[PDB]
Design an enzyme around this catalytic site. Structure first.
Site, PDB file in Angstrom:
ATOM      1  N   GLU A 188       9.137  -0.755  -3.628  1.00 20.73           N
ATOM      2  CA  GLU A 188       8.726  -0.042  -2.433  1.00 20.73           C
ATOM      3  C   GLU A 188       9.694   1.060  -2.043  1.00 20.73           C
ATOM      4  O   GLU A 188      10.837   1.107  -2.508  1.00 20.73           O
ATOM      5  CB  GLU A 188       8.534  -1.024  -1.252  1.00 20.73           C
ATOM      6  CG  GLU A 188       9.810  -1.708  -0.811  1.00 20.73           C
ATOM      7  CD  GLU A 188       9.561  -2.810   0.204  1.00 20.73           C
ATOM      8  OE1 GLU A 188       8.866  -2.550   1.215  1.00 20.73           O
ATOM      9  OE2 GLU A 188      10.044  -3.942  -0.025  1.00 20.73           O
ATOM     10  N   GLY A 189       9.199   1.961  -1.217  1.00 26.51           N
ATOM     11  CA  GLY A 189       9.966   3.052  -0.649  1.00 26.51           C
ATOM     12  C   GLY A 189       9.707   3.165   0.839  1.00 26.51           C
ATOM     13  O   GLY A 189       9.023   2.318   1.446  1.00 26.51           O
ATOM     14  N   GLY A 190      10.242   4.218   1.434  1.00 29.73           N
ATOM     15  CA  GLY A 190      10.019   4.463   2.853  1.00 29.73           C
ATOM     16  C   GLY A 190       8.588   4.874   3.159  1.00 29.73           C
ATOM     17  O   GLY A 190       8.151   4.776   4.308  1.00 29.73           O
ATOM     18  N   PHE A 191       7.833   5.331   2.139  1.00 26.18           N
ATOM     19  CA  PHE A 191       6.478   5.812   2.350  1.00 26.18           C
ATOM     20  C   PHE A 191       5.368   4.975   1.683  1.00 26.18           C
ATOM     21  O   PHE A 191       4.199   5.346   1.801  1.00 26.18           O
ATOM     22  CB  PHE A 191       6.370   7.289   1.918  1.00 26.18           C
ATOM     23  CG  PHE A 191       7.469   8.175   2.472  1.00 26.18           C
ATOM     24  CD1 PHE A 191       7.644   8.322   3.838  1.00 26.18           C
ATOM     25  CD2 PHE A 191       8.357   8.815   1.624  1.00 26.18           C
ATOM     26  CE1 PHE A 191       8.668   9.119   4.341  1.00 26.18           C
ATOM     27  CE2 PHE A 191       9.373   9.621   2.132  1.00 26.18           C
ATOM     28  CZ  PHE A 191       9.518   9.771   3.486  1.00 26.18           C
ATOM     29  N   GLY A 192       5.709   3.871   1.031  1.00 27.59           N
ATOM     30  CA  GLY A 192       4.693   3.035   0.401  1.00 27.59           C
ATOM     31  C   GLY A 192       5.185   1.880  -0.444  1.00 27.59           C
ATOM     32  O   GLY A 192       6.385   1.739  -0.696  1.00 27.59           O
ATOM     33  N   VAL A 193       4.248   1.027  -0.867  1.00 28.89           N
ATOM     34  CA  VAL A 193       4.549  -0.139  -1.699  1.00 28.89           C
ATOM     35  C   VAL A 193       3.845   0.033  -3.052  1.00 28.89           C
ATOM     36  O   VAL A 193       2.688   0.471  -3.093  1.00 28.89           O
ATOM     37  CB  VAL A 193       4.137  -1.445  -0.986  1.00 28.89           C
ATOM     38  CG1 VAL A 193       4.535  -2.665  -1.806  1.00 28.89           C
ATOM     39  CG2 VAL A 193       4.756  -1.520   0.411  1.00 28.89           C
TER      40      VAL A 193
ATOM     41  N   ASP B  83      14.655  14.460  -3.259  1.00 26.94           N
ATOM     42  CA  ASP B  83      14.886  13.025  -3.119  1.00 26.94           C
ATOM     43  C   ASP B  83      15.343  12.394  -4.419  1.00 26.94           C
ATOM     44  O   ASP B  83      14.830  11.348  -4.831  1.00 26.94           O
ATOM     45  CB  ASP B  83      13.667  12.300  -2.526  1.00 26.94           C
ATOM     46  CG  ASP B  83      14.008  11.003  -1.802  1.00 26.94           C
ATOM     47  OD1 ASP B  83      15.200  10.804  -1.454  1.00 26.94           O
ATOM     48  OD2 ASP B  83      13.083  10.200  -1.557  1.00 26.94           O
TER      49      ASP B  83
ATOM     50  N   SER C 134      18.502   6.854  -7.606  1.00 25.01           N
ATOM     51  CA  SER C 134      18.195   5.880  -8.662  1.00 25.01           C
ATOM     52  C   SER C 134      16.874   5.119  -8.437  1.00 25.01           C
ATOM     53  O   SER C 134      16.264   4.705  -9.420  1.00 25.01           O
ATOM     54  CB  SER C 134      19.358   4.931  -8.876  1.00 25.01           C
ATOM     55  OG  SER C 134      19.606   4.273  -7.645  1.00 25.01           O
TER      56      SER C 134
HETATM   57  C1  LIG Z   1       5.856   5.277  -9.081  1.00 23.42           C
HETATM   58  O1  LIG Z   1       5.702   4.215 -10.035  1.00 23.42           O
HETATM   59  C2  LIG Z   1       6.546   3.139  -9.969  1.00 23.42           C
HETATM   60  C3  LIG Z   1       7.448   2.919  -8.960  1.00 23.42           C
HETATM   61  C4  LIG Z   1       8.309   1.800  -8.971  1.00 23.42           C
HETATM   62  C5  LIG Z   1       9.354   1.548  -8.030  1.00 23.42           C
HETATM   63  O2  LIG Z   1       9.485   2.477  -7.058  1.00 23.42           O
HETATM   64  C6  LIG Z   1      10.488   2.457  -6.027  1.00 23.42           C
HETATM   65  C7  LIG Z   1      10.345   3.778  -5.281  1.00 23.42           C
HETATM   66  C8  LIG Z   1       9.045   3.902  -4.466  1.00 23.42           C
HETATM   67  C9  LIG Z   1       8.153   4.879  -5.240  1.00 23.42           C
HETATM   68  C10 LIG Z   1       9.080   5.544  -6.221  1.00 23.42           C
HETATM   69  O3  LIG Z   1       8.798   6.475  -6.973  1.00 23.42           O
HETATM   70  N1  LIG Z   1      10.265   4.923  -6.183  1.00 23.42           N
HETATM   71  N2  LIG Z   1      10.204   0.477  -8.088  1.00 23.42           N
HETATM   72  C11 LIG Z   1      10.011  -0.398  -9.094  1.00 23.42           C
HETATM   73  C12 LIG Z   1       9.051  -0.263 -10.055  1.00 23.42           C
HETATM   74  C13 LIG Z   1       8.187   0.864 -10.032  1.00 23.42           C
HETATM   75  C14 LIG Z   1       7.254   1.124 -11.068  1.00 23.42           C
HETATM   76  C15 LIG Z   1       6.449   2.244 -11.052  1.00 23.42           C
HETATM   77  C16 LIG Z   1       5.547   2.418 -12.241  1.00 23.42           C
HETATM   78  N3  LIG Z   1       5.021   3.624 -12.503  1.00 23.42           N
HETATM   79  O4  LIG Z   1       5.338   1.454 -12.984  1.00 23.42           O
END
Ligand SMILES: COc1cc2c(OC[C@@H]3CCC(=O)N3)nccc2cc1C(N)=O
EC number: 2.7.11.1
Length: 299
Positions: free
Chosen positions: A33-38, A150, A153
């Site tokens: 997850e991030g600040g804008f979605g899961v 942005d 890591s």
């Molecule tokens: C955008 O696609 C993924 C984002 C993942 C993630 O994101 C954490 C933050 C929130 C959005 C972002 O871009 N970074 N953490 C762990 C695994 C992820 C796997 C994928 C995937 N494509 O399998």
């Protein structure tokens, strides 16, 4: 200039087990997850995919969230590269806005550096390839006149071969005059990785270089960019400790590696140090960073 697949919200809801927010480690579908979605693990057309369902996890309006959704799609349509995560489609009907990506089996660089869920630590050999790949991705963005805004890591994903794939283009900005720094009234980004001028409202590709320097420190040390129970709390402050000869890069090298050598570690640290110059005009451009990272592993 690409055109993407348009998914139904209900198919994305179905293939992610009704957006099961429980971690995959306990039978759920949540990958991160991030600040804008899961981000959820899904299965569409026999292909494993990632579904990011956008939500107001931090103080943000519905209109701003829709702008970031549109911006991500717009940037992904223009920018396709080996070191950028691939968008497969999106969903704009029904309850939530979703973005569907190619599945990254090794998650984010942040999670692999912290060995989240018991994954084995990344070797120095893998870390060097990840740093080079991430720099190649930033180079492609800057060549195509885009500023990421942005770099961190959590936004460097790792595919089935641990190839680095830059992700999250919701804050990316295009600029015809790529040089010429402009200002914004809505300061966005992740504080622990932001350049001083970015914290003041400036929009420049030089800020992406500074954030990349913080990423290089995380790669060398295995430490998160910020830890409120650590001294120093901000990882970027270790550069000053090393410059003032209070400590050495060897005191900070990640102990969870067996194949690091002093020469290439000092070469990566030198690149990180140059990226972290407080004055934006003294930092190297991404082309120089790419060159220094290639010379780091040359023989
Ligand atoms: C955008 O696609 C993924 C984002 C993942 C993630 O994101 C954490 C933050 C929130 C959005 C972002 O871009 N970074 N953490 C762990 C695994 C992820 C796997 C994928 C995937 N494509 O399998």
């Amino acid at each position: 200039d690409t055109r993407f697949h348009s998914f139904s919200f209900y198919e994305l809801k179905n293939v992610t087990n009704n957006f099961d927010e429980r971690p995959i480690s306990v039978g759920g579908n949540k990958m991160g997850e991030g600040g804008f979605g899961v981000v959820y693990k899904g299965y569409v057309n026999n292909t494993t995919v990632a579904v990011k369902k956008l939500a107001a996890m931090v103080d943000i309006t519905t209109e701003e969230l829709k702008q970031q959704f549109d911006q991500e799609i717009k940037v992904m349509a223009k920018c396709q590269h080996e070191n950028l995560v691939e968008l497969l489609g999106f969903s704009s009907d029904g309850d939530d806005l979703c973005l569907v990506y190619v599945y990254m089996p090794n998650g984010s660089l942040l999670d692999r550096l912290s060995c989240l869920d018991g994954t084995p630590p990344l070797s120095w050999h893998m870390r060097c390839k990840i740093a080079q790949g991430a720099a190649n991705g930033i180079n492609f963005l800057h060549e195509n006149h885009h500023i990421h805004r942005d770099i961190k890591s959590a936004n460097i994903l790792l595919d089935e071969a641990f190839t680095a794939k830059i992700s999250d283009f919701g804050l990316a900005r295009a600029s015809e005059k790529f040089a010429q720094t402009v200002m914004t009234s809505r300061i966005v980004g992740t504080t622990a990785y932001m350049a001083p001028e970015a914290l003041r409202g400036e929009i420049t590709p030089k800020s992406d270089i500074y954030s990349f320097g913080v990423v290089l420190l995380e790669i060398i040390t295995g430490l998160p960019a910020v830890d409120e129970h650590r001294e120093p709390q901000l990882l970027l402050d270790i550069k000053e400790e090393i410059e003032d000869e209070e400590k050495t890069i060897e005191d900070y090298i990640d102990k969870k590696m067996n194949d690091a050598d002093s020469t290439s570690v000092e070469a990566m640290y030198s690149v990180a140090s140059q990226c972290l110059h407080e004055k934006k005009n003294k930092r190297p451009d991404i082309k120089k960073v790419q060159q220094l990272l290639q010379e780091m592993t040359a023989s």
